[PDB]
């Protein structure tokens, strides 16, 4: 398994497991799950009410010092009743490490904003509200950031179609750019590329 297989890191896996135990034991009020992946990445899944305390602890603790917020993302998984999974990626320059903090919310429940901890969260969760419709309570200035000014609907949700519901064209009668119901000269062709055979037995789900 030498030339064509990715070498495995075990010291980092042990250190990340120990730090996951450390965090999940310091904060039992919000932490629900702690896992470490195959490629040595630590994910801490927490309750949505403890977004501010967990992030402030990870930012300010002497043994954490996660001073950088790299990326803030939402993921749309429609089969869950809390379909939106909000993911914080943090970087610690003191210990040269990275962590992942995950929480959940649905369409109608707001999430506490983390601008008071990290200042990149302003534009990041403004984009999250724009694309997934997740409201962030106690935000300084929450509006749209990437979509059109009159756009209706959140495009990164999975029930939103690839091509939207409206399209723009210039009309000479009103001398203006107008929005009309979408009609495609060629329909986007859907491809069924999924193999009917199981690829990875290690990820096999148990039957009902």
């Amino acid at each position: 398994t030498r030339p064509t297989v990715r070498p495995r890191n075990d010291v980092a896996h042990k250190q990340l497991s120990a730090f996951g135990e450390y965090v999940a034991e310091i904060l039992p009020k919000y932490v629900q799950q702690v896992q470490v992946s195959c490629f040595s990445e630590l994910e801490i899944c927490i309750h949505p009410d403890g977004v501010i305390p967990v992030l402030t602890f990870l930012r300010d603790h002497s043994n954490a010092q996660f001073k950088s917020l790299a990326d803030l993302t939402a993921v749309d998984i429609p089969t869950r009743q809390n379909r939106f999974e909000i993911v914080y990626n943090l970087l610690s320059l003191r210990f040269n490490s990275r962590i992942r903090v995950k929480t959940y919310t649905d369409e109608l429940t707001p999430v506490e904003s983390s601008v008071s901890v990290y200042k990149a969260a302003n534009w990041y969760e403004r984009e999250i509200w724009d694309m997934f419709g997740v409201f962030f309570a106690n935000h300084p200035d929450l509006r749209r950031i990437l979509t059109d000014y009159g756009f209706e609907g959140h495009p990164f949700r999975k029930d939103f179609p690839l091509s939207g519901y409206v399209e723009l064209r210039y009309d000479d009668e009103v001398k203006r750019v107008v929005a009309e119901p979408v009609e495609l000269a060629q329909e986007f062709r859907k491809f069924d590329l999924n193999s009917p055979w199981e690829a990875f037995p290690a990820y096999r789900q148990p039957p009902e």
């Binding site: 109608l108 429940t109 707001p110 009159g150 009668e173 203006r176 750019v177 929005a179």
Partner: protein, 114 residues
């Protein structure tokens, strides 16, 4: 069955927020007509505002109508400042769109759409 509120605990404060948003839109409609050099009158703009509020008037969940008030507030702030152009303001009025037939016979004549 207990859920976390957004802004309104029950329906009364939500109705107050709807009332305030309607008052703000009704006040701003003449300035929106004048500043954007629209071809409509003030009455048509106020009728469009009332039509949107009436279209959106069958909801009984406080959180849903809180989100509706929030999105209406964003649209109002988007219009108070000159961020929308004339096309975004006039996109509420479908002038170039063809009139869609509604009865059964005309839909039967024009295509297979139910």
């Amino acid at each position: 069955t207990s859920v976390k509120p957004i802004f309104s605990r029950d329906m009364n404060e939500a109705k107050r927020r709807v009332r305030e948003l309607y008052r703000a839109w009704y006040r701003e409609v003449p300035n929106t007509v004048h500043l954007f050099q629209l071809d409509i009158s003030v009455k048509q703009g106020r009728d469009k505002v009332r039509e949107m509020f009436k279209k959106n008037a069958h909801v009984t969940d406080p959180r849903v109508v809180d989100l509706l008030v929030i999105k209406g507030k964003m649209e109002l702030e988007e219009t108070i400042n000159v961020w929308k152009q004339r096309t975004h303001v006039m996109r509420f009025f479908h002038e170039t769109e063809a009139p869609r037939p509604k009865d059964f016979l005309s839909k039967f004549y024009v295509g297979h759409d139910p």
